Design a protein around this ligand. Structure first.
Ligand SMILES: [Mg+2]
Ligand SMILES: [Mg+2]
Ligand SMILES: [Mg+2]
Ligand SMILES: [Mg+2]
Ligand SMILES: [Mg+2]
Ligand SMILES: [Mg+2]
Ligand SMILES: [Mg+2]
Ligand SMILES: [Mg+2]
Ligand SMILES: [Mg+2]
Ligand SMILES: [Mg+2]
Ligand SMILES: [Mg+2]
Ligand SMILES: [Mg+2]
Ligand SMILES: [Mg+2]
Ligand SMILES: [Mg+2]
Ligand SMILES: [Mg+2]
Ligand SMILES: [Mg+2]
Ligand SMILES: [Mg+2]
Ligand SMILES: [Mg+2]
Ligand SMILES: [Mg+2]
Ligand SMILES: [Mg+2]
Ligand SMILES: [Mg+2]
Ligand SMILES: [Mg+2]
Ligand SMILES: [Mg+2]
Ligand SMILES: [Mg+2]
Ligand SMILES: [Mg+2]
Ligand SMILES: [Mg+2]
Ligand SMILES: [Mg+2]
Ligand SMILES: [Mg+2]
Ligand SMILES: [Mg+2]
Ligand SMILES: [Mg+2]
Ligand SMILES: [Mg+2]
Ligand SMILES: [Mg+2]
Ligand SMILES: [Mg+2]
Ligand SMILES: [Mg+2]
Ligand SMILES: [Mg+2]
Ligand SMILES: [Mg+2]
Ligand SMILES: [Mg+2]
Ligand SMILES: [Mg+2]
Ligand SMILES: [Mg+2]
Ligand SMILES: [Mg+2]
Ligand SMILES: [Mg+2]
Ligand SMILES: [Mg+2]
Ligand SMILES: [Mg+2]
Ligand SMILES: [Mg+2]
Ligand SMILES: [Mg+2]
Ligand SMILES: [Mg+2]
Ligand SMILES: [Mg+2]
Ligand SMILES: [Mg+2]
Ligand SMILES: [Mg+2]
Ligand SMILES: [Mg+2]
Ligand SMILES: [Mg+2]
Ligand SMILES: [Mg+2]
Ligand SMILES: [Mg+2]
Ligand SMILES: [Mg+2]
Ligand SMILES: [Mg+2]
Ligand SMILES: [Mg+2]
Ligand SMILES: [Mg+2]
Ligand SMILES: [Mg+2]
Ligand SMILES: [Mg+2]
Ligand SMILES: [Mg+2]
Ligand SMILES: [Mg+2]
Ligand SMILES: [Mg+2]
Ligand SMILES: [Mg+2]
Ligand SMILES: [Mg+2]
Ligand SMILES: [Mg+2]
Ligand SMILES: [Mg+2]
Ligand SMILES: [Mg+2]
Ligand SMILES: [Mg+2]
Ligand SMILES: [Mg+2]
Ligand SMILES: [Mg+2]
Ligand SMILES: [Mg+2]
Ligand SMILES: [Mg+2]
Ligand SMILES: [Mg+2]
Ligand SMILES: [Mg+2]
Ligand SMILES: [Mg+2]
Ligand SMILES: [Mg+2]
Ligand SMILES: [Mg+2]
Ligand SMILES: [Mg+2]
Ligand SMILES: [Mg+2]
Ligand SMILES: [Mg+2]
Ligand SMILES: [Mg+2]
Ligand SMILES: [Mg+2]
Ligand SMILES: [Mg+2]
Ligand SMILES: [Mg+2]
Ligand SMILES: [Mg+2]
Ligand SMILES: [Mg+2]
Ligand SMILES: [Mg+2]
Ligand SMILES: [Mg+2]
Ligand SMILES: [Mg+2]
Ligand SMILES: [Mg+2]
Ligand SMILES: [Mg+2]
Ligand SMILES: [Mg+2]
Ligand SMILES: [Mg+2]
Ligand SMILES: [Mg+2]
Ligand SMILES: [Mg+2]
Ligand SMILES: [Mg+2]
Ligand SMILES: [Mg+2]
Ligand SMILES: [Mg+2]
Ligand SMILES: [Mg+2]
Ligand SMILES: [Mg+2]
Ligand SMILES: [Mg+2]
Ligand SMILES: [Mg+2]
Ligand SMILES: [Mg+2]
Ligand SMILES: [Mg+2]
Ligand SMILES: [Mg+2]
Ligand SMILES: [Mg+2]
Ligand SMILES: [Mg+2]
Ligand SMILES: [Mg+2]
Ligand SMILES: [Mg+2]
Ligand SMILES: [Mg+2]
Ligand SMILES: [Mg+2]
Ligand SMILES: [Mg+2]
Ligand SMILES: [Mg+2]
Ligand SMILES: [Mg+2]
Ligand SMILES: [Mg+2]
Ligand SMILES: [Zn+2]
Lengths: 99, 124, 83, 138, 208
RNA sequence: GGCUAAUCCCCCAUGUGGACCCGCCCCUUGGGGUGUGUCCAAAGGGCUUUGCCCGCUUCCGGAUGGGCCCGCGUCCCAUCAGCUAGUUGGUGGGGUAAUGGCCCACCAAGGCGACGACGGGUAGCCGGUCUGAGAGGAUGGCCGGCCACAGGGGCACUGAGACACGGGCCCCACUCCUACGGGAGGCAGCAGUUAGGAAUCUUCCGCAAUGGGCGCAAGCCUGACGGAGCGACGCCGCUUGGAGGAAGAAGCCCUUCGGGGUGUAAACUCCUGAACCCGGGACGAAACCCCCGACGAGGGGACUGACGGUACCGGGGUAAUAGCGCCGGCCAACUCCGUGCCAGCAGCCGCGGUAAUACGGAGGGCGCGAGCGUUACCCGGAUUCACUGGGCGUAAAGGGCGUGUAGGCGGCCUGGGGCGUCCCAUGUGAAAGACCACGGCUCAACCGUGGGGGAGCGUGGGAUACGCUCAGGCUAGACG
RNA sequence: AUGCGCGCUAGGUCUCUGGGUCUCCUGGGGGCCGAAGCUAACGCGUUAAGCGCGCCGCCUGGGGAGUACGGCCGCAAGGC
């Protein structure tokens, strides 16, 4: 089966491309708690269809670029921008913690 | 430690340090003596103990104890190193293997002969 | 080219052979597509050869080739008999 | 805030019994009502009823104890010698039907919560289903 | 090779009689009459209570010493019986009593257990008609232990057998006296067995 | 510079079919069909030559082998915190079997990072192994799978397939040849030599077996392989005798001078018969080939051994190797003598400066036994990194205090969803190993046959308590 | 030498401070004895060191040493 994942598109800036964001819960292999990790998938938007804070399915594909292996299947939920403000701010925090 | 705390940091699996750089990892190492001394044990005992400083095949240099009663070791002898320390002699982590290369088994010792390198006594 | 032959599974002086399908290019004794029988030379057992034709037939169908020894064993067990 | 509520019922009971109270009020929910149904049925508590306390509804659990004793310390043997939570918030436990535990060699239970319901151990094993393992008791 | 040397000594050491001597380890010479005390000079001297270790030890000692086994074989046999399904002490004893040489003793072809080893070794012993010279051989019940037709006539063999007239043999066997063959019908049991040994002690010895 | 053959190279021909641009239908990423238009095939050889075999060409399919891609898993240091220029995406392009910054031009300015990016250190990874009650720790030698390298670095060519260990070009180090110009090499293939090291084998036999290349075969090749040699390196089996035999010979040890000890141990009596010497003597091996039938099937039917005159069978036959550690407690085993803070022992506690069960011998004892000790290393013990399974008033351990970001965690009721969770089904979990069962070598070690298990992940179906989520209520928390 | 939050588990006694029907009861704070329980002991004990759940900080033999090197901060002192 070609794999599908679901995410929120956290940034669009790229020509013809959106970056989606996919969480996975899963139990931890020793401590056993359920832990929740995420990954950014670079996914191929041919039409500039999908916008920021849109929640989409991503599907394994024939490679588009380096780093772009996935295309955007369909729109699940339109406009949850909290998720975005989250990722946005998680990254706004790197601004601290250095020198 | 909570469990959140245990995932986000998690236990520290403790290393250890090898009480013997005969090293290379090896089980014995060949060396050549420098000084062959006679030394003064730490506080609780009293004695005179025979040890040799030794250059190793490892580019390494240590004092090594000479087990057994009598020994033939001069400053240019070649010798095999055993490892194991003596509690009461400051600085010595390694023993000497009698019967091997130059250090020769104790004359006349009839008893623990695997150690001390001596052969078996002849019989009539 | 895919083949049907003997691989050596016994011990020293005590051979036993797995009659197996594999590519000729693989080693004698390593991974093989399927085990279709066994052979015992010293014949130390009532059952020293076993086959399961229908399988061996299937392979010959798609064109693996036997050894001479393998084919010997096979026909012996009657892959080939058309009566 | 009550943080694990079920653990707090289990605890309201634990404390109650060690001081040998006749009854105890624990604040109320369907899931706790279930947890109790099993206790009652299993012999740990006498039973329980729901009550309204300044309008906020509770449940009196009513506790069982052994008979009185001899020599020093007459205090009757405990019926729930212990009761302990298992899946707690923030570390959760789930068990496939083939991991469901044998409690004190069977002389006690383990409440499992399942897709099929809230059950004891013999209950699920013979029912054939797994779940989130709430606690154990002897 | 196994322990070659004064035996009635170990009779003395385990303080009990494990006859490894055959005849006369019946007739009152085994020295366990009038010298039951242990070997050496202190054998006469008083005994200090045994560490729990020592206890375990010398009971396993008896169990082995009786059979003349090496420890290597012994302990391998044991762990082998730990694995085997069901109660280990009994299982074990079964596996020991199953030893060919032992069976040839039990069946009364030889006087000692050890003389009997010699017997297997030179293969005056046959099993189901095929000769076997291996004292470590595992007899599975239903097997039939015969003296070997060649040596049937040997002075020593009919010697034992003549004194073996009418004597009963242990119930997991059967014998034919004049025909020298006899069959091993079952693995024997704890009760089915003499043995002057607590086996559970031995298990505890391999606990550690 | 000249000669000539071909299954070597080239041009027309035929087009079953196929390639390609453009149209159309279906399909849905470049899958399939289709219609015109252009382009593309081939080699002959052997026979008993009128017919067969060995080949050749285009195409469709099968099969086995692989290329590339994705989810997830995969050591240490945060005293490594920022990293990034083909770097991130885009059009068009080159390359390839094929997607791709794989490469190029041009355009945009992105991409990654405390969920550890960048950096440094170590490291082939896995099946499995060892250890552990388990969870887990440790490891990856031999056997199997995959990777990578073939003196160091770069690069292509040939080809179905390589960027190629016994192919090639170039730079570099080293060795050897050198008419001083210039050349020749590449055991991390089997043996072997040298060095280094604590240490690691024969410059053997053989193509008989199995496998592989070429060949119509006959056959040739094969340091794959199958054997033998070497070394207690490990595992398993086996011998150094059995029964009798003293109220217990001498010697050696201690004595309370009565004796206790070694100890049935020996001597000797009887019996068996390791080694060893004659005689037979293998399976491993029926195909390829041979004839019948039609070169099928089927049927018959002869050659073919390295190991080896070894295994084994039958025959005769001799009492025929014992060593090592330990004996103060942990720990099974005790006494005199000798030494006198010495000589020494020692894993930890710690012995020895006069009566030492600790040192050095002897007698006796315990443990193992063709072994037994030592050292190194790993797990264990060690619940001493505590998931199972620890702690923090005084023992090590609560941050000087707060605000609050990420993050973790979340009252009561109802309903939708079914992401976690659970169950069923099935796919996968190669073989070896591991467990069980019978079996094969006299047993075992070793081997074979069969069985069963299995976390995890793919797929389909189902459950809805708890967890999540979406929608709606509540007021016991919180705020007003 | 006792991180914050919540629920739960005899009393007694002194006291500060609101409300009450003000022998007293009822909230909120400070002490002392002491159920159960905990604790190596001392002690703790509704102002837990009890019973629980959540989250953060921290520990892992003594000395070398809060030293060395690195980094960060600071005018220096010297801090983390
Ligand atoms: Mg955009
Ligand atoms: Mg692109
Ligand atoms: Mg930044
Ligand atoms: Mg291959
Ligand atoms: Mg009711
Ligand atoms: Mg648990
Ligand atoms: Mg058992
Ligand atoms: Mg059982
Ligand atoms: Mg019976
Ligand atoms: Mg054990
Ligand atoms: Mg020319
Ligand atoms: Mg051509
Ligand atoms: Mg043409
Ligand atoms: Mg056509
Ligand atoms: Mg088309
Ligand atoms: Mg032509
Ligand atoms: Mg094809
Ligand atoms: Mg294919
Ligand atoms: Mg593929
Ligand atoms: Mg494939
Ligand atoms: Mg990863
Ligand atoms: Mg590693
Ligand atoms: Mg540093
Ligand atoms: Mg660049
Ligand atoms: Mg492109
Ligand atoms: Mg190419
Ligand atoms: Mg991440
Ligand atoms: Mg490694
Ligand atoms: Mg490396
Ligand atoms: Mg295991
Ligand atoms: Mg194990
Ligand atoms: Mg590893
Ligand atoms: Mg591992
Ligand atoms: Mg490897
Ligand atoms: Mg390998
Ligand atoms: Mg692979
Ligand atoms: Mg290279
Ligand atoms: Mg080299
Ligand atoms: Mg190279
Ligand atoms: Mg090519
Ligand atoms: Mg080719
Ligand atoms: Mg290529
Ligand atoms: Mg290469
Ligand atoms: Mg080469
Ligand atoms: Mg060249
Ligand atoms: Mg050297
Ligand atoms: Mg070899
Ligand atoms: Mg061959
Ligand atoms: Mg061949
Ligand atoms: Mg021909
Ligand atoms: Mg050749
Ligand atoms: Mg070989
Ligand atoms: Mg052995
Ligand atoms: Mg005798
Ligand atoms: Mg005497
Ligand atoms: Mg005497
Ligand atoms: Mg004779
Ligand atoms: Mg043959
Ligand atoms: Mg034959
Ligand atoms: Mg034939
Ligand atoms: Mg041939
Ligand atoms: Mg013909
Ligand atoms: Mg035929
Ligand atoms: Mg034939
Ligand atoms: Mg021969
Ligand atoms: Mg003979
Ligand atoms: Mg003799
Ligand atoms: Mg002792
Ligand atoms: Mg000693
Ligand atoms: Mg003196
Ligand atoms: Mg003295
Ligand atoms: Mg003294
Ligand atoms: Mg002494
Ligand atoms: Mg000692
Ligand atoms: Mg001594
Ligand atoms: Mg002795
Ligand atoms: Mg050893
Ligand atoms: Mg350890
Ligand atoms: Mg552990
Ligand atoms: Mg443990
Ligand atoms: Mg814990
Ligand atoms: Mg666990
Ligand atoms: Mg602790
Ligand atoms: Mg203090
Ligand atoms: Mg402190
Ligand atoms: Mg402090
Ligand atoms: Mg504080
Ligand atoms: Mg938050
Ligand atoms: Mg809730
Ligand atoms: Mg689901
Ligand atoms: Mg399955
Ligand atoms: Mg398997
Ligand atoms: Mg195998
Ligand atoms: Mg058998
Ligand atoms: Mg096996
Ligand atoms: Mg499913
Ligand atoms: Mg529902
Ligand atoms: Mg619901
Ligand atoms: Mg709401
Ligand atoms: Mg705390
Ligand atoms: Mg008070
Ligand atoms: Mg008032
Ligand atoms: Mg108060
Ligand atoms: Mg205050
Ligand atoms: Mg009390
Ligand atoms: Mg406590
Ligand atoms: Mg108090
Ligand atoms: Mg509290
Ligand atoms: Mg330290
Ligand atoms: Mg320190
Ligand atoms: Mg300071
Ligand atoms: Mg500094
Ligand atoms: Mg400054
Ligand atoms: Mg200061
Ligand atoms: Mg300064
Ligand atoms: Zn006796």
């Amino acid at each position: 089966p070609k794999k599908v994942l679901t995410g929120v598109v956290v940034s669009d800036k790229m020509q013809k491309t959106v970056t989606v964001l996919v969480e996975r819960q899963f139990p931890h292999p020793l401590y056993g708690k359920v832990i929740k990790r995420s990954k950014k998938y670079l996914a191929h938007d041919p039409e500039e269809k999908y916008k920021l804070g849109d929640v989409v399915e991503i599907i394994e594909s024939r490679p588009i670029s380096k780093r772009k292996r996935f295309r955007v299947l369909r729109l699940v939920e339109s406009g949850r921008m909290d998720l975005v403000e989250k990722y946005l701010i998680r990254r706004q925090n790197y601004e601290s913690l250095s020198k | 430690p909570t469990i959140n705390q245990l995932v986000r940091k998690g236990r520290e699996k403790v290393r250890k340090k090898s009480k013997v750089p005969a090293l290379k990892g090896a089980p014995f190492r060949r060396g050549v003596c420098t000084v062959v001394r006679t030394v003064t044990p730490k506080k609780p005992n009293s004695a005179l103990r025979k040890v040799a400083k030794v250059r190793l095949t490892s580019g390494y240099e240590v004092t090594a104890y000479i087990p057994g009663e009598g020994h033939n070791l001069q400053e240019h002898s070649v010798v095999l190193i055993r490892g194991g320390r003596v509690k009461d002699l400051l600085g010595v982590r390694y023993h000497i293997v009698r019967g091997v290369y130059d250090a020769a088994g104790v004359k006349d010792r009839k008893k623990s002969r695997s150690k001390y390198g001596t052969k078996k006594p002849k019989e009539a | 080219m895919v083949k049907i032959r003997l691989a050596r599974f016994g011990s020293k002086h005590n051979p036993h052979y797995r009659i197996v399908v594999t590519d000729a290019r693989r080693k004698r004794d390593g991974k093989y597509i399927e085990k279709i029988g066994y052979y015992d030379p010293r014949k130390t057992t009532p059952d020293w050869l076993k086959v399961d034709v229908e399988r061996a037939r299937y392979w010959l169908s798609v064109g693996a080739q036997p050894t001479d020894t393998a084919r010997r064993l096979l026909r012996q067990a009657g892959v080939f008999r058309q009566e | 805030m009550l943080t694990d509520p079920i653990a707090d019922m289990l605890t309201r009971i634990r404390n109650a019994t060690r001081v040998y109270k006749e009854s105890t009020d624990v604040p109320a929910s369907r899931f706790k009502e279930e947890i109790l149904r099993i206790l009652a049925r299993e012999g740990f508590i006498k039973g329980y009823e729901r009550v309204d306390v300044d309008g906020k509804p509770y449940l009196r659990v009513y506790l069982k104890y052994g008979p009185r004793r001899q020599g020093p310390d007459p205090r009757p043997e405990q019926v729930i010698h212990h009761i302990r939570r298992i899946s707690k918030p923030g570390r959760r436990v789930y068990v496939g039907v083939k991991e469901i535990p044998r409690v004190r060699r069977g002389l006690g239970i383990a409440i499992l919560s399942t897709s099929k319901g809230v059950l004891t151990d013999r209950e699920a094993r013979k029912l054939g289903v797994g779940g989130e393992l709430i606690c154990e008791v002897w | 090779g196994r322990y070659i040397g004064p035996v009635c000594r170990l009779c003395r050491r385990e303080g009990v009689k494990l006859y490894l001597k055959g005849e006369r380890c019946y007739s009152p010479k085994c020295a366990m009459e009038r010298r039951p005390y242990p070997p050496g000079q202190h054998g006469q001297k008083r005994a200090r209570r045994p560490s729990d270790y020592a206890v375990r030890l010398r009971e396993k000692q008896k169990l082995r010493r009786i059979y003349g086994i090496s420890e290597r074989q012994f302990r391998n046999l044991f762990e082998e019986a730990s694995k085997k399904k069901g109660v280990t002490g009994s299982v074990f004893l079964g596996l020991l009593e199953s030893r060919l040489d032992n069976v040839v003793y039990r069946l009364g072809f030889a006087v000692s257990r050890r003389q009997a080893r010699q017997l297997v070794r030179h293969g005056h012993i046959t099993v189901n008609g095929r000769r076997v010279d291996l004292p470590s051989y595992r007899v599975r019940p239903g097997d039939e232990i015969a003296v070997a037709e060649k040596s049937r006539n040997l002075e020593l063999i009919r010697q034992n057998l003549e004194a073996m007239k009418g004597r009963k043999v242990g119930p997991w066997l059967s014998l034919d006296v004049e025909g020298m063959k006899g069959k091993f019908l079952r693995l024997p049991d704890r009760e089915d067995l003499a043995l002057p040994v607590n086996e559970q002690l031995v298990i505890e010895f391999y606990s550690r």
